[PDB]
Ligand binder design. Structure first.
Ligand SMILES: Nc1nonc1C(=O)c1cccc(OCc2nc3ccccc3[nH]2)c1
Length: 468
């Protein structure tokens, strides 16, 4: 008998799993909302803003209307190399944003020490990818890396058709603090990462006015062999591709059709992405430079450090947010959480969802979300930034691990406005002028100097319809 090889491995369920971490793909938890779980791990935060700041120049007429296509091509070329490093060193890419990716090595407490060594070596090899790299003069094709370790909480929230997850807690807070202290080419360890690490492996230096540390060198002991050490570490890595599947980047590439599993996983993925997965939309339709309105919603909690309290509050806010967005075909693109604010990146005018009066509707939707979430138990402060303009939209990442992402100055501006003007709804000049709403519905704001924004233009508070 003949023995033809190569199984089919391009099923819809596999294409869906590319959009999700192993944390979700192999998660098998209750469909109850909110769901919370607790574990330990090492977190890696890779700041990729250095090369995603490329977006505004790809709007230049020099790119002859192929700006979005060239942008996603060069972005994915560089991001795929980072992704391959994380995956081969045994990490799980949790999420992509325009400015960062976050990765997790989930492990039992006893193994934190050795796993930190694996993650430091991975971090240094990521920097190694960009050591002699540039385009057109500027060599800002480099990264900054923050590492944390310790207790991690997971939250899954959503309704009967959509799901979202977050990792939260002190190690999550720590990894963002570590990454913010980093300069180009740095690897920063959180204080707890440094307290838990194998100090014989590494040479550090102090960070001024900080308990966090910078890695100068990984200088192993004399008889150390990283390959044999890594093999020992794989004992604790549940989904590391092995044996017959050692040639694959992800075990998720071996997923077989399972309708109950697929029903669960598709809830995390936008319908237009599912349409492409199902071969009912051209594979390149979602890569575009597109005018959108960003509505960036930040929620700050009474007790920041209480996972048990914030879970129901995010769920209650989500239930209201999703009902208000449905009304104008607004979408939640991402949910993020670090400085204990939970942030919803909402988008109006995505592909096939663009409708007249985007601007008025985005403002009314922001006000509605603001009023409801302010009355939600345990939510201390709601802040909403609204910015409109040309943003890049596209699937960002590696073939085996990628996400639909929005990138652009107006994304960064809405994110900065909600942090710099807390407790209010703010909008940019485009939204204000284009709403055509009466001038007295707004308040002209003092100009603030905001991180990573230069010519922000006049900013406004959306006061609303009444003096009250
Ligand atoms: N927690 C989380 N659980 O899963 N993913 C989380 C997360 O936070 C994350 C993941 C990947 C990238 C990322 O980018 C940094 C960022 N955080 C932002 C907050 C507000 C505005 C803009 C922001 N950019 C964040």
């Amino acid at each position: 008998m003949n023995t033809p090889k190569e199984e089919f491995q391009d099923w819809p369920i596999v294409r869906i799993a590319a959009h999700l971490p192993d944390l979700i793909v192999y998660g098998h938890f209750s469909p109850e909302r909110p769901f919370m779980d607790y574990f330990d791990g090492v977190l890696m935060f890779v700041d990729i803003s250095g090369f995603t700041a490329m977006t505004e120049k790809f709007s230049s007429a020099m790119y002859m209307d192929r700006g979005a296509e060239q942008l996603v091509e060069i972005l994915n070329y560089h991001i795929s190399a980072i992704v391959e490093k994380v995956l081969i060193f045994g990490g799980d890419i949790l999420k992509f944003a325009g400015d960062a990716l976050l990765a997790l090595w989930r492990v039992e407490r006893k193994q934190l020490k050795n796993i930190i060594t694996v993650v430091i070596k991975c971090s240094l090899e990521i920097h190694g990818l960009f050591e002699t790299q540039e385009w057109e003069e500027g060599l800002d094709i480099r990264v900054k890396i923050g590492l944390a370790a310790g207790h991690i909480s997971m939250l899954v929230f959503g309704d009967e058709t959509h799901s979202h997850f977050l990792v939260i807690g002190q190690a999550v807070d720590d990894v963002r603090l570590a990454q913010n202290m980093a300069q180009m080419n740095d690897v920063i360890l959180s204080p707890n990462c440094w307290q838990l690490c194998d100090r014989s492996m590494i040479e550090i230096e102090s960070v001024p006015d900080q308990r966090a540390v910078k890695v100068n060198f990984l200088k192993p002991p004399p008889n150390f062999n990283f390959d044999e050490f890594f093999t020992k570490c794989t004992t604790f890595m549940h989904y590391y591709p092995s044996g017959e599947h050692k040639n694959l980047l992800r075990l998720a590439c071996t997923l077989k059709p399972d309708p109950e599993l697929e029903m669960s996983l598709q809830k995390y993925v936008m319908e237009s992405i599912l349409k492409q997965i199902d071969n009912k939309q051209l594979q390149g339709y979602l890569s575009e430079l597109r005018p959108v309105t960003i509505v960036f919603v930040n929620l700050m909690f009474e007790d920041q450090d209480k996972a048990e309290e914030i879970g129901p509050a995010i769920q209650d806010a989500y239930m209201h947010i999703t009902s208000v967005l449905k009304i104008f075909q607004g979408q939640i693109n991402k949910v993020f959480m670090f400085d204990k604010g939970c942030s919803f990146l909402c988008v109006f005018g995505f592909p096939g969802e663009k409708v007249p009066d985007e601007l008025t509707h985005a403002l009314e939707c922001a006000m509605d979300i603001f009023d409801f979430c302010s009355q939600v138990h345990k939510i201390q402060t709601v802040s909403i930034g609204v910015a409109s303009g040309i943003v890049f939209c596209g699937i960002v990442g590696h073939t085996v691990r990628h996400e639909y992402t929005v990138i652009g100055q107006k994304v960064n501006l809405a994110a900065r406005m909600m942090m710099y003007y807390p407790g209010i709804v703010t909008c940019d000049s485009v939204t204000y002028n284009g709403s055509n709403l009466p001038a007295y519905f707004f308040k002209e704001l003092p100009k603030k100097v905001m991180k990573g924004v230069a010519d922000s233009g006049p900013l406004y508070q959306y006061w609303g319809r009444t003096e009250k």
